[PDB]
């Protein structure tokens, strides 16, 4: 239900960002690449979030733009790819790279990244191409 956070950056420790909204310091997990776009500590930042709820955990995944949040959400809809794996994918390549690689069935791109899986990569490419046709965005 939390889709956006606007507050002050308190500390950056990739992959974590502590962002204070009110006096509540929230822990947000972001793709490594997103840390090059973040305002310096002490300044205000707007991050798009995805709230993942489980019986034993309440986590927040944060993106600089909505395009990347969409990608992440679709990514974790596939079996074998959870939040942690989706983060590495988006840390390992831009949003545009991933789309370009998926569109031409480039499995080689994905097997380089951390603990992906040869068969999972192929699986990922089929599903994502099917999933991409029903949406919109700046990244396309």
DSSP string, 91-129: HHS-HHHHHHHHHTT-HHHHHHSTT--HHHHHHHHHHHH
Cβ burial of 118 (10 Å; 0-12, 13-18, 19+) is exposed
Q: Which residues are annotated as a binding site for DNA?
A: 78-85, 114-117, 119-120, 123
Closer to a second copy by Cβ: residue 36 or 53:
53
CA atoms of 17 and 38, how far apart (whole Å): 10
Q: At its nearest, how many Å lie between a second copy and the CB of residue 104?
A: 30
CA atoms of 22 and 113, how far apart (whole Å): 38
Q: By three-state DSSP, how is residue 15 classified? A: coil
Q: Which residues are annotated as a binding site?
A: 78-85, 114-117, 119-120, 123
CA atoms of 29 and 11, how far apart (whole Å): 12
Which residues, 8 to 27, sit near a second copy by CB under 8 A? Answer: 10, 16, 18, 20-27
Residue in 40, 42, 57, 134 binding a second copy, rule: CB under 8 A:
57
Contact 70, 11 (CB under 8 A): no
Which residues, 66 to 105, sit near a second copy by CB under 8 A? Answer: none
Q: At its nearest, how many Å lie between a second copy and the CB of residue 134?
A: 15
133 touches a second copy by CB under 8 A: no
Residue in 43, 53, 115, 134 binding a second copy, rule: CB under 8 A:
53
Residues near a second copy, by CB under 8 A: 1-7, 10, 16, 18, 20-28, 49, 51, 53-60
């Amino acid at each position: 239900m939390i889709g956006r956070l606007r507050g002050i950056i308190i500390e950056k420790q990739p992959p974590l960002v502590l962002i204070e909204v009110g006096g509540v310091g929230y822990e947000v997990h972001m793709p490594m690449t997103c840390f090059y776009e973040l305002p310096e500590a002490g300044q205000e930042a707007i991050v798009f979030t995805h709230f993942v709820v489980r019986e034993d955990a309440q986590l927040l995944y944060g993106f600089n733009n909505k395009q990347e949040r969409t990608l992440f959400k679709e990514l974790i809809k596939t079996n074998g790819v959870g939040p942690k794996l989706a983060l590495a994918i988006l840390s390992g390549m831009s949003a545009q790279q991933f789309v370009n690689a998926v569109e031409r069935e480039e499995v080689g791109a994905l097997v380089k990244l951390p603990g992906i899986g040869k068969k999972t990569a192929e699986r990922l490419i089929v599903e994502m191409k099917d999933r991409f046709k029903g949406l919109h965005g700046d990244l396309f």
